[PDB]
Amino acid sequence: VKPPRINGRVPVLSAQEAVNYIPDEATLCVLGAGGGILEATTLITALADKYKQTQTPRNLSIISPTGLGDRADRGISPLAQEGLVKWALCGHWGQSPRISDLAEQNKIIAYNYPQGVLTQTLRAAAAHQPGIISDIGIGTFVDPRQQGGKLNEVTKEDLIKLVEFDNKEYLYYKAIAPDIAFIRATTCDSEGYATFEDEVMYLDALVIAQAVHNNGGIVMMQVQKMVKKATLHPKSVRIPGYLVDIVVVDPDQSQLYGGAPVNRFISGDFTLDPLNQRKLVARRALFEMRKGAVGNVGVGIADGIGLVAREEGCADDFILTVETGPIGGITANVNTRAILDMTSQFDFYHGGGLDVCYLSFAEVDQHGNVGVHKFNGKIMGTGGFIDISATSKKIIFCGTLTKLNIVQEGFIELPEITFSGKIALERGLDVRYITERAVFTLKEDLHLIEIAPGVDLDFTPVISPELKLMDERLFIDAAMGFVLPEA
Amino acid sequence: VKPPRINGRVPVLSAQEAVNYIPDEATLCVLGAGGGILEATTLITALADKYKQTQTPRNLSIISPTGLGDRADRGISPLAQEGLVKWALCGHWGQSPRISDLAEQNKIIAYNYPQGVLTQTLRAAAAHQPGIISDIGIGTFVDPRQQGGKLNEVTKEDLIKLVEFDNKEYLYYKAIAPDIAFIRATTCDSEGYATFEDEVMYLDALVIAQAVHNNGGIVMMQVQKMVKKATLHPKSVRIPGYLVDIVVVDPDQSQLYGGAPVNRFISGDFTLDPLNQRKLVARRALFEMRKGAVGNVGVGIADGIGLVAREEGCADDFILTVETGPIGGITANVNTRAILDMTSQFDFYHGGGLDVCYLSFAEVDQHGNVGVHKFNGKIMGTGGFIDISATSKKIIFCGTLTAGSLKTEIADGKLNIVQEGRVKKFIRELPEITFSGKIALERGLDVRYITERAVFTLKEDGLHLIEIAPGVDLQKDILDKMDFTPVISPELKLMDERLFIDAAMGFVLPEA
Amino acid sequence: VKPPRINGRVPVLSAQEAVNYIPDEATLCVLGAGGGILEATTLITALADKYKQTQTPRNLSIISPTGLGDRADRGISPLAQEGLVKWALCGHWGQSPRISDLAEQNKIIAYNYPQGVLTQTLRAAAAHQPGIISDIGIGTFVDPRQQGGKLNEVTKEDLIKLVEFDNKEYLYYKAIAPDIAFIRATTCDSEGYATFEDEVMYLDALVIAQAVHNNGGIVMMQVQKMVKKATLHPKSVRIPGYLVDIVVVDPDQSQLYGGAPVNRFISGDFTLDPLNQRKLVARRALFEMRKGAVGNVGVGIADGIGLVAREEGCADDFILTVETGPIGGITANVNTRAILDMTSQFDFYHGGGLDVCYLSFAEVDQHGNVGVHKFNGKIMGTGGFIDISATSKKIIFCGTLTAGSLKTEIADGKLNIVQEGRVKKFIRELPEITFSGKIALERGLDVRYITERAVFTLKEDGLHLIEIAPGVDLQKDILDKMDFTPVISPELKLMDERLFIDAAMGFVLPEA
Amino acid sequence: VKPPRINGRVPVLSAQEAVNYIPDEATLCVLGAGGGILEATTLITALADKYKQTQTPRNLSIISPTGLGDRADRGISPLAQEGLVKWALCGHWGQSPRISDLAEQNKIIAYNYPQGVLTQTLRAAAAHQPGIISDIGIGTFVDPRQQGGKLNEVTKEDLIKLVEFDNKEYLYYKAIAPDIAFIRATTCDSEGYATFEDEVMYLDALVIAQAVHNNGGIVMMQVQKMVKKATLHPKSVRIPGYLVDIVVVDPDQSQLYGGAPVNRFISGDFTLDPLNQRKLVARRALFEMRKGAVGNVGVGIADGIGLVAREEGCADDFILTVETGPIGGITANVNTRAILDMTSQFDFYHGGGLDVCYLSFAEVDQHGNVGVHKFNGKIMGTGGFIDISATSKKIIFCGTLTAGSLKTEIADGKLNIVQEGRVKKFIRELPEITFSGKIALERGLDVRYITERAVFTLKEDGLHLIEIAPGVDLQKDILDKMDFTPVISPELKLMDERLFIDAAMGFVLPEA
């Protein structure tokens, strides 16, 4: 049941009224990325409040293409009340740790498709396609020969199955359509046609809306304001109105968590005018970059690469993309060069568009496997880790091993795999592991190729004949005078 | 061997120099729709001329997501020189008929994937997905149990394969990545970052660019002008520059064929302030609409529905979408409400987005199958016909009862046949199916067949005649003009009298 | 002595640092209108703070083209600290009453040019013209044959002079240039090039900047943000950067007083989707309008005309302009049709551009002179009252017949005076003239006086009572309440019954 | 009598129908500048055609704020049919030489107000101000003590009068309001509200519309297209619709003469990515520039300064303004920084806003007076010459020392006069003064005369020769070629060697 469009106008309701249309066991899809990006907060809030006050609705399933929240009690963490959620499928998990706590305690069924694949299966679902065939995730925990993307004991049902085409290895991910969507835009007209002029980006708002709509579901959309019918520029409209069933107006909608007023640099409308360890790793990771290369800097210790490039005066010489869609820009970015929808960005990543990718690691093993989705008994999920480390041309892992000077000190077989060293070699990709103290490469036979100066050399890694001390410049609090390799 | 990017700048070349980068046997993907929409004309012209002069390159494969050209010698027709093209996969075939001539004569390998599916497989190819699973096409010529999308005898290889998931039948369409793209935008910066502010629409420019790029191919993009680096609005940039390898600047780039200067109504930047058998059909088709319904703008005899709605004062009460991406608007539309990329539009169509679907028909058989992709010995191809007739809630076929110069006069509230068509369209068994009556009933759909003299509905026991035009004889003008006998409804009535009167009907649109 | 441009960049300072560049006896010009419109609040606040703390700078002269503030302690009230200002020339005095207090108590030299004339003289001063010649103000207190615009006893120097050209009388207003400007924009680039995309309007920001710049003065500009050199759209730039000497950035800059977030309907970027005595006057005033006429949004009892016209469904048949530049719109208005600079708006008014103008009155005398600039012991000033009442085609004064705790009921299609007002507004002779009955008649203008109980028209032999409210006695409620004897029109009629009925009047707007 | 607005809609007519509304002896004001900038060509064309065909209307007065045309038969040259025009006031005359021919031949009454003053008197007329007071033009041919701005024998009525304020001399220029306007914009809505998004600039379109409107006249506006009411951005609207009486829609409207399609760099929407005597002068002119200074380069031998500054690497370190309103930019110009209305630009100029100005000369006399409005028996007029040379801080005259097929070659770091000019330009006494040496010295301005072979500076005792070109002989090439004796500076020196070498100079811009 959904409210009728009186005189063709989309129903405008309060968040409280809107969430009362969600029935028991509905499948709820939540648009958004970290730190409030494109998040319909009033809808999440009103739902959490309704279950707190009435213990309804019951046993919902959640689909979260990416990780919402503040790595604490925001995002979808408020929906982690027992009996509200029974089932969850997310591209990233640690960003709303109250949800992943439940999965950890076997309280809910829990899957993790790669974030890229997951948004693709929503787009498939919009078109009533049963699933998608991808080699993304072969040889990692999402492979049914391993965990099948299941995150805990209680998760039984198979969603991913192995298939064959051209006598070759592919995964088939089942496409699940949601019943309910919490989406958001900046502005919409009286018929629901929506533009995103002040939003940080687009994510997969249109895909989510289509997937829900074509499932006979209810799309609920939060906006900051509404305008007169047919007055928005048709080339700015990202969501056609007939896809939207309920609009919630939040006049105090903020681009990000924190309630700062609209920033038009962030909107994209104007052009804006310490030698620690993180920086050292950042610094060294930049050595892997070249002119004309398309890269991606990951969530974590790598994030400082752009700043190092700016300092070394080579930032314009290459381009860094963001998995959620923004291309280029400086530190939400400003002065971006383009913004794609999230799904299309992953389309680009899957076919090996990235020349260089920079990823964090929680654990590494003797086979060159990398673990990030699970560490210390806690569920993080992948985010876009697998989308990016599967087919990218050069893969640069970054993190601490546990003149340099190691004050207070603290690389293992992995209980679960997020990146397969073996699959990477067979695809013929160059793999690095950059550390505070030493730098490895992966080979058929992990070759130590470099070690930190001021240091002394669960498994034994080969050793390079060229085994060297890392660039000295890397260790002075001055300008490295770095030069970006040619194209 | 794409040319290097001097200091980050995308190489700018003449169309002539750009096509010299096309080697023998390359797969060429051509962006564009009918009448010049988003067509990189100079790049087509440069390849056609290079072949005319040198007989190189040779044995190219062509992918055309939709039909380019003017139903004559424009579009990719200039590419139909013998030896240039050996293989072609197109969403529509009649728009560049010189190419469909080669297919007709078995000179080339020729496939017709449904247009929507086709552009989705290109998107799949960008992600290096092997193919897509879809039930779009089941029980029609694209089904391997029928023709498997092959258009002639010479076409042998199976690209479409029957598969099963969740106890359901689906088709697996192989995804093929191109090596070369002819794409287009209005403007790009010095690094290739491209906007479409004056383009009629977007189509699947980005998808093609990604598909070719990730296949190690060479993306060639025509633009009207180039601007300083990083001065375009990031939210207007549809194609990131690292996807583009060669830019061709054509200062005389036109929005459509014809050479007309830029029309900023067509651009989207400004708001703009005869009763014959075609209007007749359009009028009766509008009766199928309701308030709040989502329909498609039809190609052919259905194209008059918008104008009739405007005349009847109900145009604002429902929404018509164009297959290639535009949504709403009036007569290139102006005053559109949104423009989606073509692929997303078909995503929406395939999931049953349309409440009402309006399509032409060349032929209808006794099972209520419909044919448009082949007739009169010619290859027309699907366009989006299968993408839209597969899962729309109401499927409304529109056309005259006979073909071949049918002439009628509407006078005195009557239909008068002054010159009958030479060809029967309502035949016994379609040689080849574009739409399955059986599959529509299975999917629970509501099927109408509107003609100028009669209206039918598809039931389980076949076509029911439900309305007959005043002025027309049931036996001589209908039964005699069909190769099968339809069930005659006990509820058979005269077509609404207001339909045949040359004044506004005072039509009231049914409630949502 | 101004700060140097380092590397071609306009210096950016804090408000506190910026105002240290203001010497003793500088002439300071303050941009802005009521309730925070285009007000450089940080600069005013900083100047005020510096004086409070240090008792410098001293003996400034102030130019305020219009009235800033909230009729209380905001606007330039902070600048009324004894010793800071010695001299002020303002188009409006009541909006910052702490300053008007200083004038009333004879503590400063105080002048009132008509607001429109005032901004034209600043524009003259930019060009180094010594003054302007205008008939605006002839026959009023700004006429040197009365008060010469001087507001108190201590003000002596004649700024206004009577002159003659083509055998006609004109005023010559002396053009005075300021030394300092406090201006504002939404955004500027690194060289000071400034746009107004989120501002309520433009006022005379460019004119002020030019007048100060060409006087060797210091232009200080508050903005919300700054952007990269040469990245703003050239057609959006209202102030060339070389006119700006100091930029202050206030990222919390608010469109209006009250610190609300930017409202994009107010910016102009998006299109927005009880019968008391004030409504009665507004209703009767609406009868003076006709299709296609241009009027002015009035301030006071008139300002509900727009809302009455919307209730009656004729709001789109004519157009209301705001003296400060905005044209059209609804209740900062939204959905405006245009925004002119303020000086240009007044050029239009002065040449008789208004078909109809609506104005409040505090007092009317027997010659039909109207007084608003001073009354009840207080200095209010003119605003644009004189610029508008000087030459508009129809001049419609609106107000109640008596004042001070007047209470009326509109019941049973009647006016009932439950409590008569204390103060008679219709007096024998104005102490000071803001509008001249004599001059308007010389100019051939149609002058109305609309009260809740009576309507008059100015003729050669004085006010003619032309209409009287139902429910009111001629002798007791009108004649005994005026200090002169109006002529009774032989066609004396009841005011239209519909005015006093709490339902839509079915008013039909007269034809163009 | 204007045609009625139907339902509030501005009448749309053909140019032919539109000009039919012009009666005999109407005063016609024509918007536009050189080369088709903002020219309502269809309206000029249609008025010219009508007179040719009908010898009506008769005896029109013309006001042309600046010079329209191509120095031949375009612009208002088609209006030169004998008996159509009897009277003309223009800011520049040479641009439509068929009209200036009529004046030379004494067939019409003919005046030249300085271009800036002229546009300012139109603005004054909008406000019903009788005229303006300005010292712009004192001591020149526009000064009544000389020619009072009258260009021939038949012109007798005094429009300009000497006056006095504050013990200083000023000119009083009569403000004349036109009866008809030919204006132009890019786009307007159905009520006349007009945007200039693709126009080269704005000029004084609004001032013209207000002047004519407030004179009971008819405002005719050519546009490229029309749009639905109230859909234009209110901050983009430059002309309120109620000022426009007739619209003529020309879908083929072109930004400039020559019919090129719209150029969006010229619109302002996008950022665009030989050693001879003229380059020599431009180079020596550049020596006069300083960091952060505001200049204007004039049409003529100086116009190469921008390109030189780009070649030398200092183009971004100062700003050049165009008299008609555009600020900054490169070769119409693109990448502009701002565009002002023309009148405001001249306000800025009149108040001494220019640090440096570059102007051409046709003649110089022993007093350092300069002539350009008449020479060789032809009326050229002033353009902005007087507005710019009257008060700018530094005035740099640029030209050759002789005229009349002068041929020079620059070789071996020397100038070589290969064929000496026929005509001496440095003469004993100017027949008529465009710029006065005395007044400039009285105003304390720095005055330079740069030629290809010699540089002079103005002083109390006349011109000082301060620099001489290498390769040139003082006596034979300079003294023998002037009809007066200059002071030879004791500090006389060779002109910078670098000027004369066919490589970048390594010029470094001084900061004062």
Distance of alpha carbon C362 from alpha carbon C299, whole angstroms:
13
Distance from CA of D207 to the nearest CA of C (A): 8
Question: B190 vs D272: CB contact, 8 Å cut-off?
Answer: no
Q: Does residue D39 contact residue D65 with C-beta atoms inside 8 Å?
A: no
- Calculate the alpha carbon distances from A241 to A39, A244, D185 in Å: 19, 5, 35
CA A328 to chain CA centroid, Å, is: 17
Q: Residue D433 in contact with residue D112, Cβ under 8 Å?
A: no
φ/ψ region of B389 (left if φ > 0, alpha if ψ in -120 to 50, else beta) reads: alpha
Decide if A273 and C225 are in contact by the 8 Å CB cutoff.
Answer: no
B472, B415 contact by CB (below 8 A): yes
Burial class (CB in 10 A: 0-12, 13-18, 19+), D72: exposed
Instruction: Name the closest residue on chain C to residue D321, using Cα atoms.
Output: C240
Chain C positions touching A228 (Cβ under 8 A) are 271-273
At residue C28, what is the residue type?
L
Partner residue facing C262 (CB), from A187, A228, A262: A262
Burial of A101 (0-12, 13-18, 19+ CB in 10 A): middle
Whole-number Å distance between alpha carbons of B227 and B189? 5
- Beta carbons of C340 and D206 less than 8 Å apart: yes
Q: Which two tokens stand for residue A433?
A: 């592991």
- Which three-class secondary structure state does DSSP give residue A239? strand
Tell if the CB–CB gap between A227 and C271 is shorter than 8 Å. Answer: yes
Place of tokens 């559109």: B336
In three-state secondary structure terms, D481 is: helix
Least CB–CB distance from A272: residue in C228, C264, C265: C228
* Closest listed residue to residue B385, CA positions, set B122, B140, B78, B32: B140
Whole-number Å distance between alpha carbons of C294 and C337:
13
Experimental method: X-ray
Q: If we measure between CA atoms, which residue out of C132, C396, C321 comes closest to residue D128?
A: C132
Contacts of A247 (CB under 8 A, 6+ apart): A10, A11, A12, A13, A188, A192, A220, A221, A222, A223, A226
List of chains touching D (3+ CB pairs within 8 A): B, C
Taken as a whole, chain D contains a residue count of 512
- Counting every residue, how long is chain B? 512
Nearest to A348 among B126, B321, B327 (CB): B126
Which of B165, B327, B352 lies closest to A131 in CB terms?
A: B165
Q: What are the residues facing D379 on neighbouring strands?
A: D374
CA distances from B256 to B265, C59, C376 (A): 13, 69, 72
Which residue in this structure is represented by tokens 């072949």?
Answer: B51
What's the rounded Cα separation, in Å, for the pair B314 and B322?
A: 19
CB contact under 8 A, D168 and C120: no
Residues of chain C with Cβ-Cβ distance to A227 below 8 Å are 270-273
Please answer whether residues C192 and C15 qualify as being in contact, where contact means their C-beta atoms are separated by less than 8 angstroms: no
Supply φ then ψ for residue D341, to 5 degrees. -65, 150
3-state secondary structure of B408: strand
Buried-exposed string D339-377: b where 16+ CB fall within 10 A, e elsewhere: bbbbbbbbbbbbbbbbbbbbbbbbbbbbbbbbbbbbbee
Distance CA B315, CA B295 (A): 12
Which residues of chain C neighbour A273 with C-beta distances below 8 Å?
Answer: 189-190, 226-229
The CA distance from D45 to D47, in Å, is 6
SS3 content of chain B, % helix, strand, coil (to 5): 25, 25, 50
With an 8 Å Cβ cutoff, are D271 and B190 in contact? no
Q: Among partner residues C132, C168, C348, which is closest to D210 by beta-carbon distance?
A: C348
Residue of B nearest to D186 (CA): B264
Is the preceding omega at residue D57 within 30 degrees of 0, hence cis? yes
Partnered with residue D189 across adjacent β-strands are: D227
- Closest by CA to B92, choosing from B120, B67, B61, B122, is B67
Domains and CATH numbers, chain B: 1-273 (3.40.1080.10), 274-512 (3.40.1080.10)
d(CA D348, CA C290): 40
3-class DSSP state for residue D111? strand
State how beta strands A294-297 and A356-360 pair: parallel
Q: Which residues contact B5 (CB under 8 A, 6 or more apart)?
A: A292, A487, B11
Which residues in chain B are immediately followed by a break of C to N over 2.5 Å? Answer: 273, 331
Tokens encoding C297:
């949004």
CA distances from B398 to B115, B279, B308, C345 (A): 20, 11, 15, 59
Q: What is the DSSP string of A244-307?
A: -SEEEE-TT--SSTT-PPP-HHHHTSS------HHHHHHHHHHTT--TT-EEEEPSSTTTTHHH
Token pair for residue A199? 């939003």
Q: How far apart are CA A71 and CA D56, in angstroms?
A: 83
Chain B residue set in contact with D, beta carbons under 8 Å: 187, 189-190, 225-229, 231, 261-262, 264-265, 270-273
C225–A264 C-beta distance less than 8 A: yes
SS3 B283: helix
**Residues of B with CB below 8 A from D10's CB?**
none
Closest CA to B443 of B370, B393, B398, B384: B393
Enumerate helices (H) and strands (E) in chain A, giving the number of each.
11, 27
Q: Contact, B340 vs B204, CB < 8 A?
A: no
**Chain C residue with minimal CA distance to A233?**
C270
As a whole number of Å, the end-to-end CA separation of chain B is 58
Q: Could you give the CA distance from residue A155 to residue A106 in angstroms, rounded to a whole number?
A: 8
CB contact under 8 A, B273 and D225: no
Q: Which residues of B are catalytic?
A: 323
> Residues in chain A, how many?
487
Residues of D in contact with C233 (CB under 8 A): 268-269
Chain B residues within an 8 Å CB radius of D9: none
Of A39, A104, A191, A323, catalytic: A323
